Write a protein that binds this ligand. Structure first.
Ligand SMILES: Cc1ncc(C[n+]2csc(CCOP(=O)(O)OP(=O)(O)O)c2C)c(N)n1
Ligand SMILES: Cc1ncc(C[n+]2csc(CCOP(=O)(O)OP(=O)(O)O)c2C)c(N)n1
Ligand SMILES: Cc1ncc(C[n+]2csc(CCOP(=O)(O)OP(=O)(O)O)c2C)c(N)n1
Ligand SMILES: [Ca+2]
Ligand SMILES: [Ca+2]
Ligand SMILES: [Ca+2]
Ligand SMILES: [Ca+2]
Ligand SMILES: [Ca+2]
Ligand SMILES: [Ca+2]
Ligand SMILES: [Cl-]
Ligand SMILES: [Cl-]
Ligand SMILES: [Cl-]
Ligand SMILES: [Mg+2]
Ligand SMILES: [Mg+2]
Lengths: 525, 525, 525
């Protein structure tokens, strides 16, 4: 067998059937004779390729396979990899290298010092020392991406390797099964359970790895048993809990002092599937107030090591959430009372308040909608105004890197064909990966894109206020016609200048058979 | 509090009380006002410092703390770090950096691009961005070294940081407890147990992480229950099983074909705490023969990813060995029969056969002796001839890097003051870290060093035979007087030119109150 | 032709005829059939191998070729590479890698992520992607080490590559000639010359790259023409000027304030072949005083970029020194007056003052002696007391990394068989690379080693005073018998407890036919 044949067999035997890519010369010998049971999803720039693959992996809860062109293609994707690292996305990033005989001279298309290029944003990065090693190296890539803590990996392959003879012993790779589905030993788990049972006022904080693990329902059971309020850890990349459940308390402010104040009076704070903590603004103070102790369950040693406070347990989130939910006592305390509905913001017949947009989405969208957020100044109101009952209902660029939501929404929609995806994206953010729209059109992936157009980088105006910064250039983005951009890439386009038009546009978008972009005129901050 | 005071408090609160070091200017502000509850162990070169710390960590089963001088000191230790990486040794390597104000100009003693220096031989490598961050960075170093899979880490600290004010919020670091003591979830563990119970001819292969976990006794119980032969995985850095137990089958040959042949007819091979596999010689063939399947339990994702065959489970070795030993059925198969005693090699009144040396050590040493091996051509015979009943009884440079055993034997002896340490070291290997002898003398650490003097790099002569290599230079090391070297560093020295003298020298060494070096004249290969 | 044959032909055609090494399994296929026109110089540990090669390269003013064993051997040499980086030593460091078929599994002896291991201490680091690329990669290594600014490079080669067929087109590599012998363009050189001619009180500062370029005599002519005082830049790795020439003003103090004070009143300061500046102690103040401007000529862009003051010209030191010496006007100012002889320090009949040792060396050594310095507390007095008339007469560890002088003195002596090498090494420093002594004995390289034995790390005691550091551990090194260590490695040993014995020992050492170690009892600091 050839390295080509053996590698595709390994991929299919490990559950991979889709290649997200933008092709190039070094990759042609990999992509030729493309297997009929695989699909290839083309995107027009590599940030888009990786964003789409990332949304697909996160929603599908399995690895996604990517093929990029050498150094330039890999480089175009590195902002996307920054998000993927923070979301623990299992991405297998492959890139083609020059033919081995031309690497030394650094011919055009040579990826120099290739394994170092995507560092430090990958778990593992490698170029094999021979063609026959390629299937083994691919096996390593698959498992490194897939083992807890999941994350992106990188494999560079010289283009002449694919036609070479494979090692017959590579067949042992095909059906390898690697598990990291582990939980704390019985003795120490009993100690933890006792501590939870004995807490007088426990609180629970959940991060993105809960949703990645589909541990949401177990966390609901855990919170109900403990009669404990539940927050989402700050800078949330996913939604780990039903947002109208009586225990839900919303998104934590991303500040040191704000969080310790919030947790004051809680004797035991159990954090599951989150870093401790992904702060954002500089809000100095106490990490925790006296009387509060913290226990973190995380899938990631790097998270456990860097937490500035608390104990930690490094284990699988799914396994730990299930064990805890089933072992803790039913507390006789009263179940927390549900948060009140948010207020309706006054809205005239002109430009839309973001609050109005979210209220209307919540009114009109199906109960199993999936939202993405890259509308950076409106995140708090989005979290308060969307009822998200189900797992996998929310995605936000995990490293804050813009250019995620537009392509990721296409990948999520591909992963979840029966759940309507609605990406709410600011006018500034929409540009970073604008060309991703084309992929939705070409493959008829019916994502809805809601562009919040206020003409400015609103979040930067806000932070400029906080940091007390005057005379900052480059904050405004006037003169972009998003309907024309959508037309450019073949996506149906609508425009909503007021509430009447917003409702009409959403009605038409929800009924449409393909992707739709709605440009919404929102109020200037 | 100062960064100095806070950092030493963090260290003591995390169980660290010993600094292995070779000092320099950048480190003086760290070492000044050295706490009276700490000890400092000086060695004369950094390979020695790290080797001693490594032996101490491996034997004590806890992290060891190291302080080296900038880039040059760190660099002198990098061969030692290669071994530490392969043995999963929890080493906290700190090095001093120039004062922050002189880093930019690259004053003498500036460690340039410091975090990159020890890569790729460390789990984590870092230089903090401010003085107040130092205690937090130290906390990260402690936990990164200590979490499974354990390994060396590196922290560089500008010398002016120590006197600066610490963050009062650093107190939250002091008592953090981080656990990776995890095992496979119940459902999947039950599946594994069933597979073991159902095997018709199981075999067990154990690696160094079994001994690191003190999982030895549980593995004995597991092997007895399953009535299974037990091998030690190739290139063994530690001994994970009693070598005269009836199930014991010895050290596996470090070859692909040799191992698959050995395992032929075994339907399920359970590997615990080893890479799959640390082959050495190139011995191409089948990874496994038809009819054999392999299941690996490893603490290290990198091991699970790169195994060319078998299933894998990434979990704590102690927790997994205990669970398996206690859950499996008692097989009604007959317990394996003990291996026969090795033959006595004919020995005249002249130079010693290595076999004679090992037989005599086995005859005379206490039953709780601890051996180290850096006699590279005699490893197979050492493994056959020493009865090692207890855990922690054997160490061999895990990456094959010479210069380990001499200093490590001093660290092991420091860790285990009641167990006589006997390091068996070739004349070639003895030189790499010869200056370590001084530390044994100065602190009166009563390690016994047995130098196997055959005048040559014997293992290289052997491999030259295998690789069919003629006219190779640099294979002979004549003209070294090891008694004089020992005298040079203050260690009592004896010489054994024949068996009578070997017995006499061992009797005197075993009775001595300090370290002793015995130069043994061994037969040329 | 084989890769082996082609690579050795490339080496000999590029002037390389000596391999400094410590062998291992991965290197056997390189070292087999070792060519009869090459020599192999064995050392017992890799810091020693590289130190010897480094001294040889620096003294010979040509590249030296090194062969080390995989990661562990490379790692043992990394402290040595820290010095080599700072001295711009042209070192070609090769290391053997596992056979390509066993790299993926990480068999014992695999150098993982090999090219990253010696970073950041090398100019170029590489592992070829195929056997046929090896000669080209070696060509790159040769030229990268040899081009200005010279420095160490690293090449890792899988052991199975050597027997493979070479590319016939590799013959084009054999006679390539690469020049960096460049100087500033005529127009701008005329401007510089004018500025020098017009200076009212110029000063000259010279660094190690002057001696590396053998630009010493041209700098003498330049200083005489300009009637300018000449200093050696701080932390000096080499001696660039005759130390009794009337213009010579000695070694600059390694402090910011000290240097600006020294240069006060000098209107133009011309620095040649030095970083600006290799400060050591933290001595904050003005980089230059008002009225002083600085012009640096350096072979190294990294030096030009990081200088905190002055203009810079990046060019070949030999070419620039020659051009300047021949173009500047003869100033009518009076030639500077020679520094007075240093005072004789009172000396009783007991332990030796370092000053006495240097005065006696100066009295007795040949006028073409070559000195090395690793006696860290006595550097200032050494510089004042040794008349060094000739180029290539002084070496000091360029990064301050101890373990340089002992092996480097052997390499220097090998390079300069007619010039008596005398290495003055502290008792502390002597241990780092003590095993290097064996190489001097084996090859009968008649280096003289003068061990300054004061029982302590004296320089650290001094800096502890400056940094105001009390209760520092690990500063004393009692109980080392250097005569026994020398005997251990086959080197004739003498001991000097007083001046009478020092003179007698030096007389015997200077007359000896082999290497000699003299242990000198020096006064405690
Ligand atoms: C790739 C990238 N570039 C720049 C930024 C910085 N950034 C953060 S928020 C923001 C503004 C985004 O504006 P928009 O999408 O219109 O949303 P708004 O803030 O107006 O709600 C920018 C530019 C970033 N996070 N990522
Ligand atoms: C730091 C380092 N340098 C070189 C080697 C290569 N090497 C492997 S075995 C060996 C010979 C050791 O000789 P000795 O200790 O006398 O034992 P013998 O082989 O004679 O039994 C050498 C040099 C190595 N493994 N590590
Ligand atoms: C590899 C390395 N380790 C540690 C140091 C720090 N250091 C600088 S000077 C010094 C003392 C050397 O003592 P010795 O050679 O006896 O000379 P003395 O200072 O007594 O004159 C030390 C340990 C260093 N520069 N390099
Ligand atoms: Ca509503
Ligand atoms: Ca906006
Ligand atoms: Ca016996
Ligand atoms: Ca030997
Ligand atoms: Ca004199
Ligand atoms: Ca000294
Ligand atoms: Cl358990
Ligand atoms: Cl479970
Ligand atoms: Cl010109
Ligand atoms: Mg990079
Ligand atoms: Mg490195």
């Amino acid at each position: 067998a050839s390295v080509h044949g053996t590698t595709y067999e390994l991929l299919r035997r490990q559950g991979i059937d889709t290649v997200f890519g933008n092709p190039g010369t070094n990759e042609l010998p990999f992509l030729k004779d493309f297997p009929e049971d695989f699909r290839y999803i083309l995107a027009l720039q590599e940030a888009c390729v990786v964003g789409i693959a990332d949304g697909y992996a996160q929603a599908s809860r399995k690895p996604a396979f990517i093929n990029l062109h050498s150094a330039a293609g890999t480089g175009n994707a590195m902002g996307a990899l920054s998000n993927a690292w923070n979301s623990h996305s299992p991405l297998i990033v492959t890139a083609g290298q020059q033919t081995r005989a031309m690497i030394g001279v650094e011919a055009l298309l040579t990826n120099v010092d290739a394994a170092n290029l995507p560092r430090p944003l990958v778990k593992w990065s490698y170029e094999p020392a021979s063609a026959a090693e390629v299937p083994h190296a691919m096996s390593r890539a698959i498992h490194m991406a897939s083992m807890a803590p999941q994350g992106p990996v990188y494999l560079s392959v010289p283009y002449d390797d694919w036609d070479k003879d494979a090692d017959p012993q590579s067949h042992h790779l095909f059906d390898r099964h690697v598990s990291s589905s582990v939980r704390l030993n019985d003795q120490d788990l009993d100690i933890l359970v006792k501590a939870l049972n004995s807490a007088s006022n426990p609180a629970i904080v959940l991060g993105p790895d809960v949703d990645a693990a589909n541990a949401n329902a177990d966390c609901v059971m855990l919170a109900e048993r403990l009669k404990a309020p539940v927050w989402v850890a700050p800078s949330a990349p996913r939604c780990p809990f039903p947002t109208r459940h009586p225990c839900f308390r919303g998104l934590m402010p991303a500040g040191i002092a704000a969080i310790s104040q919030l947790l004051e009076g809680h004797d035991v704070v159990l954090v599951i599937g989150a870093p401790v903590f992904r702060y954002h603004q500089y809000d100095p103070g106490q990490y925790l107030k006296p009387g509060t102790r913290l226990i973190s369950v995380t899938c990631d040693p790097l998270e456990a090591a860097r937490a500035p406070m608390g104990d930690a347990i490094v284990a699988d989130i799914g396994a730990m959430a299930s064990a805890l939910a089933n072992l803790v006592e039913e507390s006789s305390r009263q179940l927390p009372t549900a948060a009140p509905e948010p207020a309706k913001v006054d809205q005239d017949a002109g430009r839309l308040h973001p609050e109005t947009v979210f209220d209307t989405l919540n009114d009109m969208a199906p109960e199993n909608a999936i939202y993405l957020n890259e509308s950076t100044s409106t995140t708090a109101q989005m979290w308060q105004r969307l009822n998200m009952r189900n797992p996998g209902s929310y995605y936000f660029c995990a490293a804050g890197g813009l250019g995620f939501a537009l392509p990721a929404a296409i990948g999520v929609q591909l992963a979840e064909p029966e759940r309507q995806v609605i990406a709410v994206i600011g006018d500034g953010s929409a540009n970073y990966s604008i060309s991703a729209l084309w992929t939705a059109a070409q493959y008829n992936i019916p994502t809805i894109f809601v562009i919040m157009n206020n003409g400015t980088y609103g979040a930067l105006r806000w932070f400029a206020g906080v940091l007390e910064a005057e005379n900052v250039p480059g904050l405004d983005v006037p003169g972009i016609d998003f309907r024309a951009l959508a037309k450019g890439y073949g996506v149906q386009a609508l425009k909503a200048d007021n509430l009447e038009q917003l409702k009409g546009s959403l009605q038409e978008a929800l009924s449409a058979k393909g992707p739709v972009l709605i440009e919404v005129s929102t109020v200037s901050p």
